[PDB]
Structure formats: C-alpha cells, structure tokens
Amino acid sequence: RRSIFDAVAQSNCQELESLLPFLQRSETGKTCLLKAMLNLHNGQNDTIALLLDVARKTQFVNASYTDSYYKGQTALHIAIERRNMTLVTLLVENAAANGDFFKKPGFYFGELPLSLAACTNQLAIVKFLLQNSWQPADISARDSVGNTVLHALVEVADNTVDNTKFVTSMYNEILILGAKLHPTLKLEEITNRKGLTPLALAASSGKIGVLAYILQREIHEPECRHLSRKFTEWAYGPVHSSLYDLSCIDTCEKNSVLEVIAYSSSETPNRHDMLLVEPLNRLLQDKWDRFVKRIFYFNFFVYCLYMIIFTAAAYYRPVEGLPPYKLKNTVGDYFRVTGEILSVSGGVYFFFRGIQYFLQRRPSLKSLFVDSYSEILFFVQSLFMLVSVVLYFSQRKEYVASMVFSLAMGWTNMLYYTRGFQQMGIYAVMIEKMILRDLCRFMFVYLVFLFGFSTAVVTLIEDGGNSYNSLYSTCLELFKFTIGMGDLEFTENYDFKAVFIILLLAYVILTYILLLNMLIALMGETVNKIAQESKNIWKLQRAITILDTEKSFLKCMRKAFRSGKLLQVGFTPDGKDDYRWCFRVDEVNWTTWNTNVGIINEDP
Amino acid sequence: LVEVADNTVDNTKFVTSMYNEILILGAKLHPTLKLEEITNRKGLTPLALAASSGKIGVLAYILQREIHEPECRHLSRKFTEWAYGPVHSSLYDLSCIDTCEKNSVLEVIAYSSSETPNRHDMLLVEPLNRLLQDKWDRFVKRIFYFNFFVYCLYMIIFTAAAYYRPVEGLPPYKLKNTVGDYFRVTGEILSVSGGVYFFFRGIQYFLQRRPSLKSLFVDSYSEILFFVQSLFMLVSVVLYFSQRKEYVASMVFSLAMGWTNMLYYTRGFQQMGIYAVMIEKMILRDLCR
Amino acid sequence: LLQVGFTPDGKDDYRWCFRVDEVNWTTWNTNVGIINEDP
Ligand SMILES: C=C(C)[C@]12C[C@@H](C)[C@@]34O[C@](Cc5ccccc5)(O[C@@H]1[C@@H]3C=C(COC(=O)Cc1ccc(O)c(OC)c1)C[C@]1(O)C(=O)C(C)=C[C@@H]41)O2
Ligand SMILES: C=C(C)[C@]12C[C@@H](C)[C@@]34O[C@](Cc5ccccc5)(O[C@@H]1[C@@H]3C=C(COC(=O)Cc1ccc(O)c(OC)c1)C[C@]1(O)C(=O)C(C)=C[C@@H]41)O2
C-alpha cells in the first residue's frame, strides 16, 4: 500500500508496472484512483488509466471515502472540481457527497455531480452530464435537504455582480435544457424539504439579483417560450404594453413572494430594496389605490372616535370617594359609563390583537424593538388599560396613575396612522429611529454628568434653608439648567462660594453648551445619512399594512379583490391556451426603434 | 530601503520591489544567513523599523508576502493552508507580530508617541485587526467588564461615604460605636485606598512612557484625568488630617471627576466609544477658541 | 503552531500561524502550493 501510494504521488508507472504482475499472482478509505486524481499536476497523473484497466481486468470506480467529514466523495467529484473535462469524461465512461464538509470551513454546492458542475461555472460538464450517452444525470434529482440544481444555484448566489450574472445565466441555461429534454416536467414547481421553491427561496434569503431575474424574464425562442413571465401584449411605435405573470407573487398555496418579503424577520439582508422590483411596486400601489386606502381611512376615523371618547370619559372621572363609583340616575352618569365601557372594550381588543400578532410572528428579542415598534406600543397601552381596570375594581385609587399613562400613549399612537402619507410617514420613521438609537447614548452620557455633579453639589451643601440638601432636589435643580430655567444661586447653605459657583459653571458649560450642541450636530448628520433609507422603511411599512388589510378583508371577499386580469399569453408545449393572471404595464422608448417580434396580439 | 520609503505610491512600489529582489538574491547566495533578523544600532529590524517609522506600505508588504518560487519559499509569511473551490484558507506567520524578544509590531505601533505619521491606519493591515479582535473576544472582554464593575462599586462606595460626611465639628472626626460610623469609616478607607492605587498607577505610566508636553494632552488624556482625580483625593486627605475644613472643597471635585471618568469605560463599545472620542476632541480643540 | 514547509537546509518549518478563510468567485482556482492535500 505504501509503495503504491508513493508511486502514485511520484507519477511514476515503472514501480506500478513491476508490481502489477505480483498483485495478479497474489480510517479515511481513500482508494488508489482517488489518490492518483488528488495527486495530479497539469494532468500528469497517468497511472489512473492503468489502474482502471487493471481493476476492470480483475466496482472500484464507485469507491468513495467513508469518513464522515468526506463521506460520499468519489473520483467523479474530484475530476469535476479540478475542471478536467477529459478526465471527467474518461471517469464517467468507465452518488452524493454526504460528508460534513459538504453540509449546509466548507463549500456547499448540493450533493450531486450535476449540482457541483452547475455551481462551479463548468457549463460544458453540465451539458455533458445531462446528455451523456454512457449515462445521463437526473435533472430533477434532489439531495438530502431536497435542493435541486436550481435550489443549489440560488443558495450559492451572494449578490455580487459577477456572482449574480453567473447564477442567473446558469439558471437560465439549465432551465432551457431541462425544458428541451423533459417538456412535461415543471422544474421550478419542485420544492425542498422546508417547502420553498427557487423563487420563494430567493425571496426569503434576500437574493435580490436572482429574484429580479426570475420575476421579469422572457425567452424569445419559440421552442421554449412558456418558460417566461414577462410578455409583450402589443407595440405600435415607440409605445408598447407588456404583461407580468403574477403566478405566485400575489396568491400562492404555500407562500407568495410578497408575504415572504414583507414578513421576513429582518435577518434577510435587503428586505427594504426587494420591493422595488418591476412588478411588485406597481402591484402594491394598485392594491393601495383600489380597495385598501378607504379601509385604512375608516380605521383611522374609528380610532379617532375611540380616542375622543376615552379622553372625554377620563376627563370627567369621579373625584370624591373611593372606587368603584356607584351609578347615578343622571344622564351625564349614563354617558360617562358608556364612555368607560367603550374605552375598556377598545383596550381588550388591542390586547387580544397584540397577543395574536406576537403568537403568529414569534419575534426574537433583538428584532422585537426593530420590526414591531408599533405593535409593542399598542400592546403596552392595552396593558396599562387592563392594569387600570384591575386596580379600579380592587378599590384602589392608583388606577388613575395607570389610566393617564395609557391616555397619553393613546394620542401619541396616532402617529402610527401617518404611514398612509409619504411625507409624514417618513417623519414618523425618523422619530422612531432617533428614539431607538441616539437618545440612549445621549441619555447615558447626560445622566453620568448630571449625577456626578449633583452628588458633588449636594455633598458641598450643608443645609444650615429650604432643605436643598437632598439628592432629588439637587438633581431637579441641575436639570432645570438644561431647559433654560436654571437659577445660578438657588441656595446659600455652603461654606465655600467659589467651589459652588465653579461647579455650577463647569456643569453648565459641559452640558448646556457642549453636550446639547453636540447632540444637535449628531441629529443633523443622522438626518443626512438616512434621507433615503427612511423612504424604503416607510414603503415596507405601507406594504405590511396592505397585506394585513387584505388578509383581514379576505373574510368579506376572499377572491373578489384580485389583482391583474386573466389573459392568454400563448400555447403550452403539449396542449394550448396558456392562461395566467397577468398585470399589464405600458412603456415608451424612443432610442431603440421597434426591433423585436413576439407581440402576443395582432392589433394594439 | 525602509528609511528611504516616504509612503508615496510609486516610492512604495519601488521600495517593496527592491526589498523583495534583494531578499531573493541574498537567499540564493547565502541560504544559511537570516537577513531580516539583523538589527541596527538602535536594535530595530526592517519590519520593526517600518512599523516604528510609520511606513504603512512597507509594513503591509512585509506582513503579507508570499514567494511561490520553490527555490526560495521559506522567505514568506502568508501561506495557503488549502483550497477546494472558490473557498480557501490561508495562514499568517505572526513571528514577531504578537510576541518578540526585542519589540513586537503591535506594541511598537500602539505605544508610538504620535510623532509617527499614521499610527491609526497601521492597525488595518490584514493580520493585525483580526488578531486584535481575536484577543478581545477570547480573554480580554471579561477582564475589561470586571474592571468596569469594580470601578462602579468603588464609585458607589465613595459617593455613599462622601454623602454622609460628618458636618458638626472640625476634622479629624472621632469614631463612634454606632454601626453607621463603622460603615462610613470603611467607606472612607476604601476611597483612600482607591485614590492611592490610581496615584501609583499614574506615576508608573508617566515614568514608563515619558510623554512630551505637546503629546501629553493628545495621547494621555485619560491617564491625566485619573491622575488628577487621585491628586485631588490625596490633597483632600492631607488637608483632612491637618485639621482643615477645606478638605471637602477638594473632595467634591474629586468626586465629580470620578463619575465623569466612567466615560473611559465606554471604549469597550463602538458606538459610545466614538461619542467619548468626539467629546474629548471637541473639549481639546473647539472650546479653547 | 503549524508546519508550513521545509527549511532550505533542514526541514519542518514550524511557526505560530493565524489561519483565516477567504472566498473569491472571479478568479477560478488557478494557483499551486496548497500546504495540505485535503481541505
Ligand atoms: C416601548 C418604548 C420605547 C417606550 C414606551 C413609552 C413609555 C414611551 O417611552 C419610551 C422611552 C422614552 C421615554 C422618554 C422619552 C423618549 C423615550 O419610548 C417609548 C415611548 C416613546 C413615545 C414617542 O412617541 C412615539 O414614538 C409615537 C409613535 C411613533 C412611531 C410609530 O410607528 C408609532 O406607532 C405606534 C408611534 C411616547 C410614549 O409612548 C408616551 O406617550 C409615554 C407616556 C412615554 C413614551 O419607552
Ligand atoms: C485636564 C483637563 C482638560 C480638564 C480637568 C477637569 C477639571 C475638567 O475640566 C477641564 C477644562 C474644562 C472646564 C470646564 C468645561 C470644559 C473643560 O477639562 C478637563 C476636564 C473635563 C471633563 C469632561 O468630561 C470628560 O471628559 C470625561 C472623559 C472623556 C473621555 C475620556 O477618555 C475620559 O477618560 C478619563 C473621560 C469633566 C471634568 O473633569 C470634571 O468632572 C470637573 C469637575 C471639571 C472637568 O480641565
């Protein structure tokens, strides 16, 4: 064994030739062929052919490494990786890499020779394997996870421009070849174990390039034209109207692309930019303009009424006695009690809606305050209302201490409804983001400074006065300096006036002049950085609003409000009458001058 | 060759190319001799000299250089452990980047007196940033957080003991059998011990580094502030045991400084470390004018 | 501590290395000198 391995590594067949007659007369698992293939330089491994001939003259071709790390690897995989067309053909003429190296430091390409060839830019080897006379590869085969070659191609994509160009081109080539070989089979419809298709997988994983390619792709070849999603309804001059498939973009049995993009947990790289693709933005705008805007405005109006009733009923709360408060025959009492009942009902409604959302989505802690700010705020207001009810019926007077907070939250939650308008939706987005990010840092630093100087000042004071020798009072008096209401001499119970005035001046210069102006500068810089990002965040928020409204209204009319019209785009390869729910859009282009064919309809 | 380099793009290309050529020829003629190991009178090697003088181009060339020629391959620092497809894992030498007998590159870059042109950008080279992040994640983060926690405890004890200072009489204040007096005296002892500790640490730093006056407030802001707080504490002690009531006039200042020194510990976090950096720089530059 | 090759006179060039991975689509595998046979 050692001598054979040494001869194979040395690329010398003299020792192997001498030992062959002797053999005839007489943890890893690597075979002689695998070792020869691995230890090959510039195709200098010549012992492979002799070893294969000897093995045939004496099952060895399929020998594979048995190690869990490299389980399943064979000579064909090594040849394919090495980019040896001749060696690959020779090995094929005369499996799945399940090893941990090839599972989801490692490289994932699927677990089939066809997938490995497809993911590596060896198109010729893909073609040869697909139409190899000795043995053709199975285009529809799936690995352990269930990914096909198309799933593997989607997984490989990393949004790099060259990588995107590759993955899209190879996807198109494999699609066309698969259609040519097996017209009946629908390759894209296949799903992996998780249940996602290549399009759904691309939308879920954030691969914007693959999604953009798939959504709007046209194959002009008459041989394979049904493998397209964007057609051309007609064209007269520089004007032409086209269609988009919208097959599983609007409503799909498993999961549509819109809801996969919108309901992503923000771990997806670029959810915000994934809705700018050609069909999706226009589809969302169509849904907004058609039937969602009126429902949104009605919801806003009803919330306004609820808040007005809540404010009126809380303003006129009974003040004399202890809760609960017995009813009175006066009409005012009846109206007040009606207001309280309506407020409590609204609180319960929001409580249940928040619980429903948190169960359905199961957000993680990190993304809880980054993707569900509005839901958290509404749920917290409902929680305050319910605590207020519990205290009120427990003969406690602290219920008001809860109620007011809820009431305050109520009004400040009206900003949620500013997402129906672009220019105010962006303003609310910036308010949210600044509150989340900047104020935490600013307040940590501010409180460090304030507490340090308040402790120093109250230590200096001796109260011997107005009992200013209190930490709370000194903290409040030093905080007043920040809001332009600070008295420089608010006490005289100190033995040393110079120390007191020096401390106050230092605090004023360090916080009022330095920290606050620095915060102004940082807010200005942040406004510039996120001028465009806020627009994308607002668009995502409105898209989620549209999806929620449509899902809620599905009960009233599940399929009545469907986007796009059913149209015939051509004939199927086997039958005819290729009917699909298309979404027409027009376009005008002076430069190119009408040079194309395939206009579905004769007359514009 | 290192001395000649002036960080110009053409100059850098020259100096690196000639360095490589001379290295290869020297290896061919005299394989046994290790040319780079030689040092000048000051004791620096070409790599250490490049790191010290701020020559970022020469440092970047030296740190990550591979000579594929089989004749002279050991004259390389960045290898290639393996490669399967578009994925490959490589290695870096780290010979005298982490620990060196004379002076490692990391400590030469970090402990430079800011006269070096571009200390700040010299840590972005391929091995150094990842090496520092590895050290942070592995064993330094926990010690930093423990130090922050202990400083928080010290500051809380100091604040509590200074808040309840005796007000009637003249120092020193005789002890009382009450438990509150025992706790207060324990707080004072702990505060004084912390002040002495920071005093000695500041003296140690200033002796080891010997900063110049110009760079004193540009490279050792935190050290100066901690030393000044310790100085205030010691002056407070001296006045307190001299039967003077002005010790409080010192103590409070120290106390104030104490809390505002917590910002030193915001460098364990990027987004607040940058904020503290800007506070420092603005205080130094803009407010004077 | 890892072995990176053989010294010009002796052998077993051992040094304290710091491994890092890299991924690159564009260039397509064209080099030699991989220290280890198997990834
Ligand atoms: C859950 C969180 C973060 C939060 C809950 C409450 C207590 C809140 O204080 C904060 C912390 C705070 C405290 C003081 C000033 C700023 C922030 O911020 C919000 C939270 C911050 C707001 C600011 O107003 C808004 O953000 C409205 C709003 C903006 C964007 C939205 O998409 C939105 O949809 C619901 C609502 C107002 C309060 O909710 C309010 O009215 C009360 C009494 C305190 C504010 O805690
Ligand atoms: C050595 C110097 C420059 C200094 C020492 C003290 C007296 C200081 O005033 C200054 C001058 C001054 C006075 C008033 C306003 C701004 C600046 O600035 C600092 C110095 C300025 C600060 C500002 O807070 C900080 O800078 C905290 C800090 C930031 C960055 C750090 O890396 C850091 O590490 C220790 C600490 C607070 C004081 O130290 C403080 O608490 C007291 C009572 C006065 C401030 O002199």
Side-chain angles (χ1 to χ4, degrees), chain A residues 369 373-374 376-378 405 408-409 412-413 415-416 419 428 431-432 435 439:
Chain A
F369 282 67
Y373 187 71
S374 306
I376 291 156
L377 289 198
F378 275 93
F405 268 99
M409 303 210 52
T412 57
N413 287 359
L415 261 67
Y416 165 85
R419 66 191 50 188
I431 289 173
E432 178 181 1
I435 278 171
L439 274 189

mmCIF file of all heavy atoms in Angstrom, chain A residues 369 373-374 376-378 405 408-409 412-413 415-416 419 428 431-432 435 439, ligand 1:
data_model
loop_
_atom_site.group_PDB
_atom_site.id
_atom_site.type_symbol
_atom_site.label_atom_id
_atom_site.label_comp_id
_atom_site.label_asym_id
_atom_site.label_seq_id
_atom_site.Cartn_x
_atom_site.Cartn_y
_atom_site.Cartn_z
ATOM 1 N N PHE A 369 -37.819 45.109 19.041
ATOM 2 C CA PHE A 369 -37.909 46.561 19.023
ATOM 3 C C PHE A 369 -37.439 47.167 17.707
ATOM 4 O O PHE A 369 -37.425 48.395 17.578
ATOM 5 C CB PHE A 369 -37.086 47.153 20.172
ATOM 6 C CG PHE A 369 -37.767 47.075 21.507
ATOM 7 C CD1 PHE A 369 -37.990 45.853 22.118
ATOM 8 C CD2 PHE A 369 -38.181 48.226 22.155
ATOM 9 C CE1 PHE A 369 -38.617 45.780 23.345
ATOM 10 C CE2 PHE A 369 -38.805 48.160 23.381
ATOM 11 C CZ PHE A 369 -39.024 46.935 23.977
ATOM 12 N N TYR A 373 -42.174 47.880 16.550
ATOM 13 C CA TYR A 373 -42.290 49.029 17.441
ATOM 14 C C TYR A 373 -43.754 49.395 17.680
ATOM 15 O O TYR A 373 -44.193 49.555 18.828
ATOM 16 C CB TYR A 373 -41.523 50.204 16.834
ATOM 17 C CG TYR A 373 -41.403 51.429 17.705
ATOM 18 C CD1 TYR A 373 -40.597 51.433 18.834
ATOM 19 C CD2 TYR A 373 -42.076 52.596 17.378
ATOM 20 C CE1 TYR A 373 -40.483 52.559 19.621
ATOM 21 C CE2 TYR A 373 -41.965 53.724 18.157
ATOM 22 C CZ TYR A 373 -41.169 53.702 19.276
ATOM 23 O OH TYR A 373 -41.059 54.829 20.052
ATOM 24 N N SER A 374 -44.530 49.515 16.603
ATOM 25 C CA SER A 374 -45.927 49.917 16.731
ATOM 26 C C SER A 374 -46.732 48.881 17.503
ATOM 27 O O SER A 374 -47.570 49.231 18.346
ATOM 28 C CB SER A 374 -46.531 50.134 15.345
ATOM 29 O OG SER A 374 -45.759 51.047 14.587
ATOM 30 N N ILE A 376 -45.649 46.779 19.747
ATOM 31 C CA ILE A 376 -45.269 46.860 21.153
ATOM 32 C C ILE A 376 -45.966 48.032 21.823
ATOM 33 O O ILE A 376 -46.473 47.914 22.943
ATOM 34 C CB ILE A 376 -43.741 46.967 21.295
ATOM 35 C CG1 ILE A 376 -43.078 45.658 20.888
ATOM 36 C CG2 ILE A 376 -43.364 47.320 22.718
ATOM 37 C CD1 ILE A 376 -41.654 45.829 20.451
ATOM 38 N N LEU A 377 -45.992 49.191 21.160
ATOM 39 C CA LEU A 377 -46.590 50.365 21.788
ATOM 40 C C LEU A 377 -48.090 50.176 22.005
ATOM 41 O O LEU A 377 -48.617 50.508 23.078
ATOM 42 C CB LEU A 377 -46.316 51.608 20.944
ATOM 43 C CG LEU A 377 -44.875 52.132 20.909
ATOM 44 C CD1 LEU A 377 -44.846 53.568 20.422
ATOM 45 C CD2 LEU A 377 -44.195 52.030 22.258
ATOM 46 N N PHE A 378 -48.795 49.639 21.008
ATOM 47 C CA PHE A 378 -50.227 49.405 21.178
ATOM 48 C C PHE A 378 -50.486 48.377 22.275
ATOM 49 O O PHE A 378 -51.401 48.546 23.097
ATOM 50 C CB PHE A 378 -50.843 48.948 19.857
ATOM 51 C CG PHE A 378 -51.238 50.075 18.946
ATOM 52 C CD1 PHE A 378 -50.367 50.539 17.978
ATOM 53 C CD2 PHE A 378 -52.482 50.667 19.050
ATOM 54 C CE1 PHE A 378 -50.727 51.572 17.139
ATOM 55 C CE2 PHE A 378 -52.845 51.701 18.213
ATOM 56 C CZ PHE A 378 -51.968 52.149 17.259
ATOM 57 N N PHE A 405 -51.365 57.403 31.955
ATOM 58 C CA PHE A 405 -50.297 56.931 31.086
ATOM 59 C C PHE A 405 -50.879 56.360 29.804
ATOM 60 O O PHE A 405 -50.555 56.820 28.701
ATOM 61 C CB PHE A 405 -49.445 55.886 31.810
ATOM 62 C CG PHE A 405 -48.263 56.467 32.524
ATOM 63 C CD1 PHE A 405 -48.304 56.702 33.886
ATOM 64 C CD2 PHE A 405 -47.113 56.791 31.828
ATOM 65 C CE1 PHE A 405 -47.218 57.244 34.540
ATOM 66 C CE2 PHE A 405 -46.026 57.334 32.478
ATOM 67 C CZ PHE A 405 -46.079 57.561 33.837
ATOM 68 N N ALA A 408 -52.134 59.098 27.596
ATOM 69 C CA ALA A 408 -51.056 59.763 26.879
ATOM 70 C C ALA A 408 -50.623 58.916 25.693
ATOM 71 O O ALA A 408 -50.676 59.365 24.540
ATOM 72 C CB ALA A 408 -49.880 60.024 27.819
ATOM 73 N N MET A 409 -50.299 57.646 25.954
ATOM 74 C CA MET A 409 -49.877 56.763 24.876
ATOM 75 C C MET A 409 -50.883 56.815 23.742
ATOM 76 O O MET A 409 -50.513 57.001 22.577
ATOM 77 C CB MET A 409 -49.721 55.333 25.397
ATOM 78 C CG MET A 409 -48.747 55.201 26.556
ATOM 79 S SD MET A 409 -47.883 53.620 26.658
ATOM 80 C CE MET A 409 -47.215 53.444 25.007
ATOM 81 N N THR A 412 -50.331 59.698 21.343
ATOM 82 C CA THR A 412 -49.066 59.589 20.635
ATOM 83 C C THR A 412 -49.025 58.385 19.710
ATOM 84 O O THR A 412 -48.089 58.273 18.914
ATOM 85 C CB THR A 412 -47.905 59.517 21.628
ATOM 86 O OG1 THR A 412 -48.099 58.412 22.516
ATOM 87 C CG2 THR A 412 -47.811 60.802 22.427
ATOM 88 N N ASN A 413 -50.005 57.486 19.796
ATOM 89 C CA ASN A 413 -50.098 56.377 18.858
ATOM 90 C C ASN A 413 -50.804 56.763 17.569
ATOM 91 O O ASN A 413 -50.764 55.992 16.605
ATOM 92 C CB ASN A 413 -50.820 55.193 19.508
ATOM 93 C CG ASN A 413 -49.968 54.494 20.544
ATOM 94 O OD1 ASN A 413 -48.822 54.868 20.775
ATOM 95 N ND2 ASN A 413 -50.529 53.474 21.179
ATOM 96 N N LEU A 415 -49.676 58.695 15.556
ATOM 97 C CA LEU A 415 -48.606 58.753 14.572
ATOM 98 C C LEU A 415 -48.503 57.465 13.772
ATOM 99 O O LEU A 415 -48.019 57.492 12.635
ATOM 100 C CB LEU A 415 -47.277 59.049 15.266
ATOM 101 C CG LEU A 415 -46.842 60.511 15.210
ATOM 102 C CD1 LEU A 415 -47.786 61.383 16.017
ATOM 103 C CD2 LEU A 415 -45.420 60.664 15.704
ATOM 104 N N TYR A 416 -48.964 56.342 14.326
ATOM 105 C CA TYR A 416 -48.987 55.108 13.550
ATOM 106 C C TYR A 416 -49.718 55.306 12.235
ATOM 107 O O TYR A 416 -49.344 54.709 11.221
ATOM 108 C CB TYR A 416 -49.656 53.986 14.345
ATOM 109 C CG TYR A 416 -50.033 52.787 13.502
ATOM 110 C CD1 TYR A 416 -49.114 51.783 13.236
ATOM 111 C CD2 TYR A 416 -51.305 52.662 12.966
ATOM 112 C CE1 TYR A 416 -49.455 50.693 12.467
ATOM 113 C CE2 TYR A 416 -51.651 51.575 12.196
ATOM 114 C CZ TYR A 416 -50.725 50.596 11.949
ATOM 115 O OH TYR A 416 -51.069 49.509 11.180
ATOM 116 N N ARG A 419 -48.508 56.732 8.330
ATOM 117 C CA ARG A 419 -47.870 55.943 7.284
ATOM 118 C C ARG A 419 -48.725 55.831 6.030
ATOM 119 O O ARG A 419 -48.244 55.308 5.020
ATOM 120 C CB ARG A 419 -47.543 54.541 7.799
ATOM 121 C CG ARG A 419 -48.763 53.693 8.134
ATOM 122 C CD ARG A 419 -48.374 52.425 8.873
ATOM 123 N NE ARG A 419 -47.495 52.689 10.005
ATOM 124 C CZ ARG A 419 -46.897 51.749 10.725
ATOM 125 N NH1 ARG A 419 -47.058 50.467 10.456
ATOM 126 N NH2 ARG A 419 -46.120 52.111 11.744
ATOM 127 N N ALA A 428 -42.438 60.191 10.889
ATOM 128 C CA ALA A 428 -42.649 59.240 11.976
ATOM 129 C C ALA A 428 -41.548 58.187 12.001
ATOM 130 O O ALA A 428 -41.111 57.753 13.076
ATOM 131 C CB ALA A 428 -44.020 58.579 11.837
ATOM 132 N N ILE A 431 -38.580 59.774 13.663
ATOM 133 C CA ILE A 431 -38.810 59.867 15.103
ATOM 134 C C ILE A 431 -38.520 58.527 15.766
ATOM 135 O O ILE A 431 -37.789 58.446 16.763
ATOM 136 C CB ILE A 431 -40.247 60.335 15.397
ATOM 137 C CG1 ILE A 431 -40.411 61.811 15.031
ATOM 138 C CG2 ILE A 431 -40.593 60.096 16.862
ATOM 139 C CD1 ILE A 431 -41.837 62.311 15.130
ATOM 140 N N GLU A 432 -39.089 57.453 15.214
ATOM 141 C CA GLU A 432 -38.854 56.114 15.747
ATOM 142 C C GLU A 432 -37.365 55.799 15.812
ATOM 143 O O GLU A 432 -36.850 55.372 16.855
ATOM 144 C CB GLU A 432 -39.574 55.086 14.877
ATOM 145 C CG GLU A 432 -39.370 53.646 15.300
ATOM 146 C CD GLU A 432 -40.091 52.672 14.390
ATOM 147 O OE1 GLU A 432 -40.733 53.130 13.422
ATOM 148 O OE2 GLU A 432 -40.005 51.450 14.636
ATOM 149 N N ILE A 435 -35.366 57.911 18.391
ATOM 150 C CA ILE A 435 -35.667 57.476 19.752
ATOM 151 C C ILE A 435 -34.949 56.171 20.058
ATOM 152 O O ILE A 435 -34.400 55.988 21.151
ATOM 153 C CB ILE A 435 -37.188 57.337 19.956
ATOM 154 C CG1 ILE A 435 -37.809 58.702 20.249
ATOM 155 C CG2 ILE A 435 -37.492 56.358 21.086
ATOM 156 C CD1 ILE A 435 -39.321 58.701 20.260
ATOM 157 N N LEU A 439 -30.997 58.633 21.453
ATOM 158 C CA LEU A 439 -31.317 59.089 22.797
ATOM 159 C C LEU A 439 -30.720 58.180 23.860
ATOM 160 O O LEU A 439 -30.389 58.654 24.944
ATOM 161 C CB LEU A 439 -32.832 59.195 22.982
ATOM 162 C CG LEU A 439 -33.506 60.501 22.538
ATOM 163 C CD1 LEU A 439 -34.957 60.520 22.990
ATOM 164 C CD2 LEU A 439 -32.778 61.732 23.064
HETATM 165 C C1 LIG D 1 -41.595 50.965 24.395
HETATM 166 C C2 LIG D 1 -40.922 52.119 24.422
HETATM 167 C C3 LIG D 1 -39.538 52.509 23.815
HETATM 168 C C4 LIG D 1 -41.285 53.404 25.045
HETATM 169 C C5 LIG D 1 -42.813 53.282 25.702
HETATM 170 C C6 LIG D 1 -43.424 54.710 26.199
HETATM 171 C C7 LIG D 1 -43.380 54.737 27.729
HETATM 172 C C8 LIG D 1 -42.683 55.861 25.573
HETATM 173 O O1 LIG D 1 -41.269 55.989 26.289
HETATM 174 C C9 LIG D 1 -40.120 55.178 25.763
HETATM 175 C C10 LIG D 1 -38.772 55.613 26.348
HETATM 176 C C11 LIG D 1 -38.712 57.155 26.254
HETATM 177 C C12 LIG D 1 -39.029 57.924 27.373
HETATM 178 C C13 LIG D 1 -38.987 59.313 27.291
HETATM 179 C C14 LIG D 1 -38.630 59.929 26.093
HETATM 180 C C15 LIG D 1 -38.318 59.154 24.976
HETATM 181 C C16 LIG D 1 -38.361 57.764 25.053
HETATM 182 O O2 LIG D 1 -40.162 55.317 24.429
HETATM 183 C C17 LIG D 1 -41.186 54.689 24.008
HETATM 184 C C18 LIG D 1 -42.332 55.564 24.143
HETATM 185 C C19 LIG D 1 -41.997 56.932 23.251
HETATM 186 C C20 LIG D 1 -43.175 57.879 22.689
HETATM 187 C C21 LIG D 1 -42.844 58.750 21.452
HETATM 188 O O3 LIG D 1 -43.967 58.780 20.589
HETATM 189 C C22 LIG D 1 -43.961 57.835 19.543
HETATM 190 O O4 LIG D 1 -42.997 57.184 19.322
HETATM 191 C C23 LIG D 1 -45.228 57.679 18.678
HETATM 192 C C24 LIG D 1 -45.073 56.666 17.517
HETATM 193 C C25 LIG D 1 -44.040 56.808 16.587
HETATM 194 C C26 LIG D 1 -43.911 55.890 15.544
HETATM 195 C C27 LIG D 1 -44.820 54.837 15.444
HETATM 196 O O5 LIG D 1 -44.673 53.929 14.388
HETATM 197 C C28 LIG D 1 -45.858 54.685 16.371
HETATM 198 O O6 LIG D 1 -46.773 53.612 16.248
HETATM 199 C C29 LIG D 1 -47.406 53.200 17.445
HETATM 200 C C30 LIG D 1 -45.983 55.609 17.409
HETATM 201 C C31 LIG D 1 -44.328 58.353 23.616
HETATM 202 C C32 LIG D 1 -44.633 57.446 24.775
HETATM 203 O O7 LIG D 1 -45.093 56.203 24.295
HETATM 204 C C33 LIG D 1 -45.750 58.136 25.610
HETATM 205 O O8 LIG D 1 -46.704 58.704 25.179
HETATM 206 C C34 LIG D 1 -45.382 57.970 27.052
HETATM 207 C C35 LIG D 1 -46.227 58.429 28.262
HETATM 208 C C36 LIG D 1 -43.912 57.572 27.112
HETATM 209 C C37 LIG D 1 -43.437 57.289 25.675
HETATM 210 O O9 LIG D 1 -40.414 53.738 26.049
#
